[PDB]
Design a protein around this ligand. Structure first.
Ligand SMILES: [Mg+2]
Lengths: 724, 51
RNA sequence: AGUAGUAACAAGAG
RNA sequence: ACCUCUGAAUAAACUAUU
RNA sequence: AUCUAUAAUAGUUUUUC
């Protein structure tokens, strides 16, 4: 008998065994070399989707720009970016007419957000494309470099600390004739002076790379990293789009998890109830083909212009900057290529900046065609990409556009016997169509498809299907008269997370508990998951039981600790103790779970604030998944690859930054608890605080006049040093 | 080493199905080197964690 | 050779 | 050639925990 | 009855010929 696991679906409905279709136990696919090929493919495809548009040369950067707006109406079902501006404006108008006041109230909330947001909002995130180095940097590091460069060039409006003032500084930098930077090499500092067009090309540039560890995709794809100049504008536009989306029932963003599932189920059931019993109902499990390569920044500018009608001019300008910068964007080509000589047995890296005027004999046929197609667009080492939204940006504004198209499906707008509605999340959608008969269903689907074509939305025919309402798929959630559990999606979360011993134990037990609550993880499987996690935890951290003879480097110390302990159950698993977790106590931290079983001296050593592994007191170092800090809350080593580069002065600079920050925290105790705000310098703020505190201590008699005078003398000395 | 000692019948190794793209005598030499170094670690009266 | 798959590793840098 | 260093951080939303 | 704290970390979701 040949074993056929797929035959299980003959009796178990596919949604009820959907976990079997996710092979998430093996390693995900990765990208090995460069991303230049994928980036060039994306640029060529984006320009191909708009090839019948109008070509212009940008007067400020010189980049050729393709404009598909108001292009010819398509005659086939191929993807295209020929969105009609009047159709988009009419969709926005009807969305506003069906939900009166949505844009006005969203604009009020966004005005409050714009006026109140601080500059350090930009540090939230992993990487930002640093134009001063032509590569990705940590968001805080990129922001610090940009601020230092702006200060050296007399652009100091960001000293207010507000994000909008930083955006004003960006706008002012756009008008500087020359921007100066500083470069390091093999470690001295050199000044480089960009010109206006060079800086403008750098500021409009988004970095590109490949996406690693992506599930369900046979082929790799390119992704983007926004630069420092555009991040604030994108944040403000997305804040407005979020305010709009919060007021829309069809929106799939920004609600996630159980709240999202409940909202979607309620919306679907409301649609079912509003449907007459004497009419057919069909749901479309729909995807869109190349949503971000067909949507145009000019249409987003039009949407923002319609949304911000009757608003103050400054608000309209600050919202409009982002689509304007996105319609003049450049794309970094990437690493380039590597060339291999078989006879001479050598390999070499070809930078992407040489692809403008490199001989085409080296490349193969497909890459040569890519380079030939993209060479007219190449400028200053980047590619001109006017059409398209690059990658994972303006998702909620895309949701707004999709919801407007869905909203166009009321009977007041269709003006016929059919109507539609559904769900929208960025580009993914689900559509419910009602009609007296099948002809009406076909007509409604056709009208939805053609309206989407008008606004530049192409429904992926090969990835969409339609059936009677009751089952659909939306944003990887499988609905079979209700959302079903999908355990395989959370399966990679089980295991040793890799923070430290205490945090990893907490993560393991919390993941088991959360999957019991949410993903229908049964009690027996929860116990087995706990056993497997304990096994992996003991193997990973070399913390097997003391009464075992697993030969590790740590086994002798654990044996010694086990021998001298009286109450073995009190030892943590990190110390070789037993596992006391079961279903009933998954929610309890380990140190608290076995606190009363510990020896007094072992407990005193474990929870000793004067231990070197963690920076009547308690152990404190950012204590995620670590309720009680012990000696097991240590911090692993950082990567040392930067010591071989020219950026190794950043280590000394950050050491001095940490020193100054800790000294400041010595003056403002609440600084760590809540982020301090202020335009004054650190030394000035500290001196003022010291003076007021010394005066108060003298007044209340906590210190004597001699100490007050000494503090005043030291403050005067610091003031003297401050100027010089 | 103990598992190897539990088997009697070790003949002189010879190639049965060769690797068509590789150098099979290198594989034979690799196996013989493995046997030789197993004997070496067996004869050093202190078996280490790694070889 | 092998891994692997639209580009790489099969050490790199000083 | 010895020697020395090093083992590699997309976006957005969400979820979990602190 | 209502109910997006702030921040940090990790995880999850988001494909043309
Ligand atoms: Mg979908």
């Amino acid at each position: 008998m040949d074993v056929n696991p797929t035959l299980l679906f003959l009796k178990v409905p596919v949604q009820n065994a959907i976990s079997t279709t996710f092979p998430y136990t093996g390693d995900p696919p990765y990208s090995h070399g460069t991303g230049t090929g994928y980036t060039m493919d994306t640029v060529n495809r984006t320009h191909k989707y708009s090839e019948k548009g109008k070509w212009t040369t940008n007067t400020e950067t010189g980049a050729p720009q393709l404009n598909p707006i108001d292009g010819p109406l398509p005659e086939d079902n191929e993807p295209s970016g020929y969105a009609q501006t009047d159709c988009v404006l009419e969709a926005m108008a009807f969305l506003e007419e069906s939900h009166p006041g949505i844009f006005e109230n969203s604009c009020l909330e966004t005005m409050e957000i714009v006026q109140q947001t601080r500059v350090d909002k930009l540090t939230q995130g992993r990487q930002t494309y640093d134009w001063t180095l032509n590569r990705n940097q940590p968001a805080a590091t990129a922001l610090a470099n940009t601020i230092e460069v702006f200060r050296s060039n007399g652009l100091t409006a960001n000293e207010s600390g507000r994000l909008i003032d930083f955006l004003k500084d960006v706008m002012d930098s756009m008008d500087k004739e020359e921007m100066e930077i500083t470069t390091h090499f093999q470690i001295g500092k050199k000044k480089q002076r960009l010109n206006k067009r060079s800086y403008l090309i750098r500021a409009l540039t988004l970095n590109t790379m490949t996406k690693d560890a992506e599930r369900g995709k046979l082929k790799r794809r390119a992704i983007a990293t926004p630069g420092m100049q555009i991040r604030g504008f994108v944040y403000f536009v997305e804040a407005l789009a979020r305010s709009i989306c919060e007021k829309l029932e069809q929106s799939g963003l920004p609600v996630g998890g159980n709240e999202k599932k409940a909202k979607l189920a309620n919306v679907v059931r409301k649609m079912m109830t509003n449907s007459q019993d004497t009419e057919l109902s069909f749901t479309i499990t729909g995807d869109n083909t190349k949503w971000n390569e067909n949507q145009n920044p000019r249409m987003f500018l039009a949407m923002i212009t319609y949304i911000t009608r009757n608003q103050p001019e400054w608000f309209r300008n600050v919202l409009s900057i982002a689509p304007i910068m996105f319609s003049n964007k450049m794309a970094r080509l990437g690493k380039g290529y590597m060339f291999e000589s078989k006879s001479m047995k050598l390999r070499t890296q070809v930078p992407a900046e040489m692809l403008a005027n490199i001989d085409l004999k080296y490349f193969n046929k497909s890459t040569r065609e890519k380079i030939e197609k993209i060479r007219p667009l190449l400028i200053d080492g980047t590619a001109s990409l006017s059409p398209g939204m690059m990658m994972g940006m303006f998702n909620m504004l895309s949701t707004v556009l999709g919801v407007s198209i869905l909203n166009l499906g009321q009977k007041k707008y269709t003006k016929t016997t059919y109507w539609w509605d559904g769900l929208q999340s960025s580009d993914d959608f689900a559509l419910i169509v009602n009609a007296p008969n099948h002809e009406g269903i076909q007509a409604g689907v056709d009208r939805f498809y053609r309206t989407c074509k008008l606004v530049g939305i192409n429904m992926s025919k090969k990835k969409s299907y339609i059936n009677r309402t009751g089952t659909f798929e939306f944003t990887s959630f499988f609905y079979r008269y209700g959302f079903v559990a999908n355990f395989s999606m959370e399966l990679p979360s089980f295991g040793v997370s890799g923070i430290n011993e205490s945090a990893d134990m907490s993560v393991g037990v919390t993941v088991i508990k959360n999957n019991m609550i949410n993903n229908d993880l049964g009690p027996a499987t929860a116990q087995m998951a706990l056993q497997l996690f304990i096994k992996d935890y003991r193997y990973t951290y070399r913390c097997h039981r003391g009464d075992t003879q697993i030969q590790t480097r740590r086994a002798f110390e654990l044996k010694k600790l086990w021998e001298q302990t009286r109450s073995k159950a009190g030892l943590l698993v990190s110390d070789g103790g037993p596992n006391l977790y079961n279903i009933r106590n998954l929610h309890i931290p380990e140190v608290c779970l076995k606190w009363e079983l510990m020896d007094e001296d072992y407990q005193g050593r474990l929870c000793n604030p004067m231990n070197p592994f963690v920076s009547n007191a308690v152990v404190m170092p950012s204590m995620e998944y670590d309720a009680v800090a012990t000696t097991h809350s240590w911090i692993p080593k950082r990567n040392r690859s930067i010591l071989n580069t020219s950026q190794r002065g950043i280590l000394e600079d950050e050491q001095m930054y940490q020193k100054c920050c800790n000294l400041f925290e010595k003056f403002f105790p609440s600084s760590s608890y809540r982020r301090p705000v202020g335009i004054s310098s650190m030394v000035e703020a500290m001196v003022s605080r010291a003076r007021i505190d010394a005066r108060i201590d003298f007044e209340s008699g906590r210190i004597k006049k001699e100490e007050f005078a000494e503090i005043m003398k030291i403050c005067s000395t610091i003031e003297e040093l401050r100027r010089q | 080493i103990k598992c190897m000692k539990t088997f009697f019948g070790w003949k002189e190794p010879n190639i049965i199905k060769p690797h068509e793209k590789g150098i099979n005598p290198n594989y034979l030499l690799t196996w013989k080197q493995v046997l030789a170094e197993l004997q070496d670690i067996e004869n050093e009266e202190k078996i280490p964690r790694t070889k």
